[PDB]
Amino acid sequence: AFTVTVPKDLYVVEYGSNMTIECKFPVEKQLDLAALIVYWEMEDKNIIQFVHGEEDLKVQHSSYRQRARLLKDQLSLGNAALQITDVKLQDAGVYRCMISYGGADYKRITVKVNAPYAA
Amino acid sequence: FFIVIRDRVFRCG
């Protein structure tokens, strides 16, 4: 059946860095953007809502505005990759990626953020 | 959309 997988279900990230978290989904030949849905969320917060090839930014949570990007070039490889820049302490938690292309699935990914500490 | 996977719900907007 249609299955999403995660290479890594835990990312440990430095405060202030950029992170790219990924989920894999099955692709064959044409990927019809009309039929594809990619959604990323954390807690009650929408991050990406990519539907019929368009992102709805109206629904995106304010904390991710101008910080969050779907790497849409990765989609032909079967990779829904979310890049978050300038990672905050508040970015730590459980993220969900949901992909629909006929069938639908999701997975969890945990992000831990290391607070700034001088060696 | 309103999609349910393993008793978790995903909804637009």
UniProtKB/Swiss-Prot annotation, chain A:
This is Programmed cell death 1 ligand 1. Highly expressed in the heart, skeletal muscle, placenta and lung. Weakly expressed in the thymus, spleen, kidney and liver. Expressed on activated T- and B-cells, dendritic cells, keratinocytes and monocytes. Disulfide bonds join C23-C97. Induction: Up-regulated on T- and B-cells, dendritic cells, keratinocytes and monocytes after LPS and IFNG activation. Up-regulated in B-cells activated by surface Ig cross-linking. Glycans are attached at N18. Interacts with PDCD1. Interacts (via transmembrane domain) with CMTM4 and CMTM6. Interacts with (phosphorylated) STAT3; promoting nuclear translocation. Interacts with CD80. Belongs to the immunoglobulin superfamily. BTN/MOG family. The chain holds residues 18 to 134 of 290 of the full protein. Plays a critical role in induction and maintenance of immune tolerance to self. As a ligand for the inhibitory receptor PDCD1/PD-1, modulates the activation threshold of T-cells and limits T-cell effector response. Through a yet unknown activating receptor, may costimulate T-cell subsets that predominantly produce interleukin-10 (IL10). Can also act as a transcription coactivator: in response to hypoxia, translocates into the nucleus via its interaction with phosphorylated STAT3 and promotes transcription of GSDMC, leading to pyroptosis. Residues 2-110 form the Ig-like V-type domain. It is found in: Cell membrane; Early endosome membrane; Recycling endosome membrane; Nucleus. The gene is CD274. It is linked to Truncation of the 3'-untranslated (3'-UTR) region of CD274 transcripts leads to elevated expression of CD274 in multiple cancers including T-cell leukemia, diffuse large B-cell lymphoma and stomach adenocarcinoma. Disruption of 3'-UTR region is caused by structural variants that stabilize CD274 transcripts, leading to overexpression. Increased expression in tumors promotes immune evasion and tumor cell growth by allowing malignant cells to escape destruction by the immune system. Ubiquitinated; STUB1 likely mediates polyubiquitination of PD-L1/CD274 triggering its degradation. Ubiquitinated by MARCHF8; leading to degradation. Deubiquitinated by USP22; leading to stabilization. It comes from the Eukaryota.
